[PDB]
Amino acid sequence: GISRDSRHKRSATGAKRAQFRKKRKFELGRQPANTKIGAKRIHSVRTRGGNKKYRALRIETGNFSWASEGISKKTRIAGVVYHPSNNELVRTNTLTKAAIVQIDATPFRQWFEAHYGQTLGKKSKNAERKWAARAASAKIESSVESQFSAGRLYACISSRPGQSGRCDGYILEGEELAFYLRRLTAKK
Amino acid sequence: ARGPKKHLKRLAAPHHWLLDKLSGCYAPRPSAGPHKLRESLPLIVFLRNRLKYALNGREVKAILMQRHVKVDGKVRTDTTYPAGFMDVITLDATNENFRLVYDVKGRFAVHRITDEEASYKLGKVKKVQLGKKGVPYVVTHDGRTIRYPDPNIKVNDTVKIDLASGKITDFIKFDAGKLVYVTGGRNLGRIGTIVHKERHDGGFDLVHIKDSLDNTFVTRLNNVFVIGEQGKPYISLPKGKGIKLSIAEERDRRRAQQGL
């Protein structure tokens, strides 16, 4: 079907090769999986060597990570806002590795309330000592607070959906976040 | 060709098996095991072409299924079990123990060893790593992986496994001045001391070895197996003490032990 061998393309000199053999199996390729947004629907695929690649066809509520506090929460995915490679996947909301998506906010803000105690967008003396020990570290930059006030964050998917099923990622921080806002506001 | 190969024709066997080119058109092809097939000796060849105890395939088969041949203290019932270098295979029914070691000419030779000192086996530790769950382990030339080694044991050294469960006894460091035996190449079967080791980053550090009669040679590090220090190797050497004398004095020795 889909071939990966280097024998159907021209050589470095423009020389046209000839068919050395039929299409072998150990160089096969498989059909793409344009994974959409919806309820979870996953098909498994048997691979060379007898392993499995969990092809995710529809997925939501993936894992996402905050690097600075280093936490990870299972969160819904509102949808793709920017894709670096192709533009049509933004229109049809197709997930890939390294994709700029918009996700919901709430598990992060409940963790922040339970962990630091301060509020964004506007008893228990042991927990008071916990907050005092965790004080003088509650400052984050302005744009993440503005997103928390909005209720949706900009994250980047850094996991392969069609190769392992999961749709994992990290929320943007700093220079990455600034560059992606600049590109998003310049294009859109 | 669509899968692994299971047959081995004659005129594709190792030459040190000493297989006759007539009397059949096929060779054993040892199955997977401790050694690669090009450096291995199947039990069928060892028991019908070296000892002449068997006569054919079915007699050595009846030997093996009668549970009399043990490789490394374990009973093996394959005719094509690849017995290789520094194996201590035993025949308990007749009370001899054998050790496989290259002769002076480069072929696997019979070498009778006692009840004692058949209780160990040397092994070139080939690569050391740190396994899963933090445990450190070594693996030698015959696939044996031994956990919790002595920390001074590094890559390309010699350990001394006894028989039972690994349990590495006193080992040998790799440095100049040690008795060294050869397991590959043109100088296959000579013994000697390292006089120097040359280092070449990128590939194949070489070793300069001088034997007991001041005949020096150079070999790649993959064919180097240090067996001890000067004067007292820990194993019993084969006949001729691994010297590789030239043809003229070999013919002189033929004319010396000729007659009576």
Partner: protein, 185 residues
């Protein structure tokens, strides 16, 4: 799939086939030593040329090369063990100096001529063919046996073969039977 069996032809035809001189020499050799055809002369000349090529390209080798010493000693040793070279000619220029005749002299047919016992060279050939002579103990019927030196003194009549006793042959048996049935009664 069985390994090929190796073989080699052991004679060679002359390039110039037809001239008077060597034809005269070959017919002379056949007359003196009892030869069936010209294959025997070609065989001895071929093995002699092989020997001389070996002696020659060891002679082009420099002195005290161990290969030259070893192979020269082996070649001289085999050609004195056959008995063609004399004892006092163990040199490479001397092994270059051989002929066809002294190779043909060391054959068994010529030797069973020379030790008595045959009284004619063609009688020697037909009586060596006919299974009458044991070298050592073993009965041999090959005229081109190339007798060595250590087996030179053992050429005797066989334990079979009525020339060495042991139940006289077929024609004598039938003659005795005829004279028994006729002149007996």
């Amino acid at each position: 799939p069985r390994a090929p069996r190796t073989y080699s032809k052991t004679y060679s035809t002359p390039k110039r086939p037809y001239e008077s001189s060597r034809l005269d020499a070959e017919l002379k050799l056949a007359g003196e030593f009892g030869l069936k055809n010209k294959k025997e002369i070609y065989r001895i000349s071929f093995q002699l040329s092989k020997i001389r090529r070996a002696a020659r390209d060891l002679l082009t080798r420099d002195e005290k090369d161990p290969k030259r010493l070893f192979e020269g000693n082996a070649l001289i040793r085999r050609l004195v063990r056959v008995g063609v070279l004399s004892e006092d000619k163990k040199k490479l220029d001397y092994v270059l100096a051989l002929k066809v005749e002294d190779f043909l002299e060391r054959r068994l047919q010529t030797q069973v001529y020379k030790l008595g016992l045959a009284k004619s060279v063609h009688h020697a050939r037909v009586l060596i063919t006919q299974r009458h002579i044991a070298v050592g103990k073993q009965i041999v019927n090959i005229p081109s046996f190339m007798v060595r030196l250590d087996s030179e003194k053992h050429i005797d009549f066989a334990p079979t073969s009525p020339f060495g006793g042991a139940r006289p042959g077929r024609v004598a048996r039938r003659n005795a039977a005829r004279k028994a049935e006729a002149s007996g009664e």
